[PDB]
Design a binder for these strands. Structure first.
Ligand SMILES: [K+]
Ligand SMILES: [Mg+2]
Ligand SMILES: [Mg+2]
Ligand SMILES: [Mg+2]
Ligand SMILES: [Mg+2]
Ligand SMILES: [Mg+2]
Ligand SMILES: [Mg+2]
Ligand SMILES: [Mg+2]
Ligand SMILES: [Mg+2]
Ligand SMILES: [Mg+2]
Ligand SMILES: [Mg+2]
Ligand SMILES: [Mg+2]
Ligand SMILES: [Mg+2]
Ligand SMILES: [Mg+2]
Ligand SMILES: [Mg+2]
Ligand SMILES: [Mg+2]
Ligand SMILES: [Mg+2]
Ligand SMILES: [Mg+2]
Ligand SMILES: [Mg+2]
Ligand SMILES: [Mg+2]
Ligand SMILES: [Mg+2]
Ligand SMILES: [Mg+2]
Ligand SMILES: [Mg+2]
Ligand SMILES: [Mg+2]
Ligand SMILES: [Mg+2]
Ligand SMILES: [Mg+2]
Ligand SMILES: [Mg+2]
Ligand SMILES: [Mg+2]
Ligand SMILES: [Mg+2]
Ligand SMILES: [Mg+2]
Ligand SMILES: [Mg+2]
Ligand SMILES: [Mg+2]
Ligand SMILES: [Mg+2]
Ligand SMILES: [Mg+2]
Ligand SMILES: [Mg+2]
Ligand SMILES: [Mg+2]
Lengths: 73, 56, 133
RNA sequence: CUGGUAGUUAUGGCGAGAAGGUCACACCCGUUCCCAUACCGAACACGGUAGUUAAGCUUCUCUGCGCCAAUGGUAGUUGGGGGCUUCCCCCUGCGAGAGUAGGUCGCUGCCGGG
RNA sequence: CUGGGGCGGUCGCCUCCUAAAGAGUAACGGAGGCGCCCAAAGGUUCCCUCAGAAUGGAUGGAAAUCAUUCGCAGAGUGUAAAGGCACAAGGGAGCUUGACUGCGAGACUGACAAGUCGAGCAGGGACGAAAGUCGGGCUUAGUGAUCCGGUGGUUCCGCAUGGAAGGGCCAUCGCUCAACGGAUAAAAGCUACCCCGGGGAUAACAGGCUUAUCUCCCCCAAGAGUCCACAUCGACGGGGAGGUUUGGCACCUCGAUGUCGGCUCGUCGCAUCCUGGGGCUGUAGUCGGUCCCAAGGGUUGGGCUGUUCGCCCAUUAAAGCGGCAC
RNA sequence: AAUAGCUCACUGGUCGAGUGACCCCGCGCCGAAAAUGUACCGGGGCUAAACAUAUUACCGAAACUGUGGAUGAACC
RNA sequence: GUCAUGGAGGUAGAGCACUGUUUGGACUAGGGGCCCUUCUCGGGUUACCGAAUUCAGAUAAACUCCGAAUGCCAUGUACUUAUACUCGGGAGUCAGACUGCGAGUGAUAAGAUCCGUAGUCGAAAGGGAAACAGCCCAGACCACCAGUUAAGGUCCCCAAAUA
RNA sequence: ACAAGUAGUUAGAGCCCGUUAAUGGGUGAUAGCGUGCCUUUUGUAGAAUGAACCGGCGAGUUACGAUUUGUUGCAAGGUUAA
């Protein structure tokens, strides 16, 4: 009566902290905001975080319990 | 300046160890290599200390 | 001893590596029966050991059962090939890791406590040591 | 000195106690006008400043709650070895969680009035 | 597909655990969902905060609504689960249709087919004073290709030419094709009358591993035994040995390891049925019981059952239990 | 049968050195029965030729080295 | 490959802050036993249950206030090393096995089965483990009546200690 | 004619020879080592398959297309078919 399961959705980080990315590069795939959009980063309709401009990826803390990813040129 | 001698076989050893031994420049068993004592080389030696012998 | 209900009817056997994380020091009674090596203690073994302790005390002093059988285990009947999903739940066990005080007793003199606990220990599949507070 | 406005994982919070006030801030008085209530000038908005530090507000004290937190030891564990292999032990490196000594009633920037 | 095959179950998609702190990861492993819904449950502006408990109040009861205090979420989030969410992604109200057209640097994911995210540009808008946000919904299921048909549109083609027929292109609709990458528009059984190609890749016999089960031996000792745990037994539990059972596995053999019982011939083990020696006895005696040593020899004629086995008749010192391809 | 009877505990005497509990560790013992033949060290055999801790010599591979030869690649 | 630096990520462990499972107190609510002037409306008792409540103590694959070691992604102006990628021509493979470690299924059985991860076999001769694909040591270009060592050994079979 | 043999191989006396004359030939007491070949397999000395032996015969070819590499000729050209 079991035997079922969906395809795995290859979620999680797609570029590293300190890595140069082009504009539009997906940084993080996630359900909801495990990580929040930082500066020069946007949240897609499925919570995908992406670089709005070229630059270096930086994962920072944004207040005790939360976390964010920025892109600094 | 270190003198590093490969004293055990790489047969039976995991890839990481083989790749470290290769990067150290060692070949056949009892091969010998002379290296400048750095933290980088010392770190390699630590990973394969059970395979090699180290002089000065 | 049986869980009143369970989130999941079937469950991994698990493992018994390491010293029990808690319940390694007698905390309620004077004397305790400490597991020296790891083993599954079934509810049928806990009852056997409890009655053996209790009968010898003659409704005198207290008996704490410090382990509870939280983990179900399943079996396949004889004449059933492997596969076709997990077998039906058989019984209930407490994975007892080494150093876990399984029973404790107070309100009887040392000799009776020490005797009660050796009678209890002979019903358990694990090497035991009698320890006091 | 106080109003505004930021930054900083609560060492910044909560709770308790106390003091202060046209220099702002506040409550406070009114519903004529703009504007309000799925009813209500409570709120929101607008017009006043008789009244008051009681509250918020600001400053000061406190470790009751939280929060932060070593050292040491232990668990675990990469690699390397042993066993009597439900598991266990030794060597090398890394090393928690808990608990404890202790720390904390914030720190930092700009702007206006004083 | 399948721990042989059949029967049963399953077949596509989503969430979790398994999954070993990136990603990925199997089993007829453990749990649940889906084949939609919504004209607002969508967009935007502005405003807001839930559950529960305590206490007091008419019908009012434990629990309706009202008021106060305490309440980081113990609520909610259309719908499983996970990840999120109180600057709310949760709750109100006003206006709206961005649930827009053309696209799209660049990424993710993927054998392919497909799938996913996307700043930004233009057209023309919604809301907003503006900033700005808006290419559906907190996120991730809600789907199905091609071929062939149907309808709509069209500065495309139109077989001498003008037309037309018909085709193309753009948009959209029609099969549980669900065995969900869909053999066809259209598909059930028996074979012991069978045949060929193959396989020890895979079952039935025997062997092997395993030993749950089985037989035997033990530990503990509550009980039983006229008193009396241990003459003889022994619950609840616990620990072994053996490899005769019931099983598990599929490792040898399918270019054949060809058969249950009986007959003939035995041989071996000892966990001993008899006979020999001994300890204990609930051993007065007789007749027994039980354990230790002991494998030298011995260990049956019939009736019924194909029957191993069993039951029965009649014997015997005894009518032992196992192994050796049962 | 009840009595009687023998014995201990508990004391002086003789004798003239040790004697009695409990806990921990090492190594051993019983528990230990299968089928052709010893048959659960390969054998012999071992009281170390076993085990523990420490040490040092040697043996031991087609490993590595020596000598000679063949050969692939790369670079001068 | 290592060093350094940065980062994502919730496993081992641990913990009980949440969710479930759970033991023993203490504490009141109540209902049910128990007696009852009573209409069981109200009292007095209880250890018969009880749902909260705190105190102490446990427990988890599908719990997490916490959280490693490793592994992974990057960066470097670091030190070693020698591959990488792209496009073409040609393949074979799609029965795997065992061992160690981490899991599932199983009985925490299997030389079982199914993944992960490393190794060896496969496709690897040699030495050791009596014999013994998968264990330990170790990789055979050819010749040598040379040498040194590995695992494993050194009383005899049998090379070396009756060290 | 006291021996346990995948039949050899390495070591090797003894005896008998004498060549394409070179660290030669025949035989082999005795000692060490040693599980045919092929196929098929995770794995075969295999108690899996195939072959009694010897000899002969016995399996990727050709045509026409495609593509790619090499060679040669000519080259913004190259080349003819019937
Ligand atoms: K026991
Ligand atoms: Mg999966
Ligand atoms: Mg969407
Ligand atoms: Mg190894
Ligand atoms: Mg089947
Ligand atoms: Mg099977
Ligand atoms: Mg993962
Ligand atoms: Mg025409
Ligand atoms: Mg399909
Ligand atoms: Mg017939
Ligand atoms: Mg046939
Ligand atoms: Mg088979
Ligand atoms: Mg098959
Ligand atoms: Mg069989
Ligand atoms: Mg056989
Ligand atoms: Mg198999
Ligand atoms: Mg045959
Ligand atoms: Mg006997
Ligand atoms: Mg008969
Ligand atoms: Mg037979
Ligand atoms: Mg060599
Ligand atoms: Mg754990
Ligand atoms: Mg966990
Ligand atoms: Mg297997
Ligand atoms: Mg493995
Ligand atoms: Mg093969
Ligand atoms: Mg080999
Ligand atoms: Mg050998
Ligand atoms: Mg072979
Ligand atoms: Mg030597
Ligand atoms: Mg010798
Ligand atoms: Mg002889
Ligand atoms: Mg002779
Ligand atoms: Mg034969
Ligand atoms: Mg033949
Ligand atoms: Mg060609």
């Amino acid at each position: 009566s079991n035997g079922r399961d969906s395809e795995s959705k290859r979620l999680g980080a797609k570029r590293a902290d300190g890595q140069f990315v082009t504009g539009g590069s997906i940084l993080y795939r996630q359900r909801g905001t495990k990580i929040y959009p930082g500066t020069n980063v946007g949240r897609g309709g499925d919570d995908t975080l992406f670089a709005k401009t070229d630059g270096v990826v930086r994962f920072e803390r944004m207040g005790r319990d939360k976390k964010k990813v920025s892109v600094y040129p | 300046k270190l003198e590093i001698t490969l004293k055990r076989s790489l047969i039976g050893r995991p890839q990481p160890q083989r790749k470290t031994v290769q990067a150290l420049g060692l070949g056949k068993t009892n091969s010998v290599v002379v290296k400048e004592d750095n933290p980088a080389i010392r770190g390699m030696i630590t990973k394969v200390s059970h395979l090699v012998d180290v002089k000065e | 001893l049986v869980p009143k209900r369970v989130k999941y009817r079937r469950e991994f056997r698990g493992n018994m590596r390491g010293r029990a994380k808690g319940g390694t020091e007698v905390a309620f009674g004077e004397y305790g029966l400490q597991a020296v090596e790891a083993s599954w203690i079934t509810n049928r073994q806990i009852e056997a050991a409890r009655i053996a302790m209790t009968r010898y005390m003659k409704r005198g002093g207290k008996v704490w059962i410090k382990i509870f059988p939280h983990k179900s285990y399943t079996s396949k009947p004889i004449g059933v090939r492997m596969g076709k999903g997990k077998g039906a739940p058989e019984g209930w066990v407490s994975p007892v890791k080494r150093g876990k005080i399984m029973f404790e007793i107070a309100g009887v003199p040392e000799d009776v406590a020490r005797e009660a606990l050796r009678l209890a220990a002979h019903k358990l599949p694990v090497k035991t040591k009698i320890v006091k507070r």
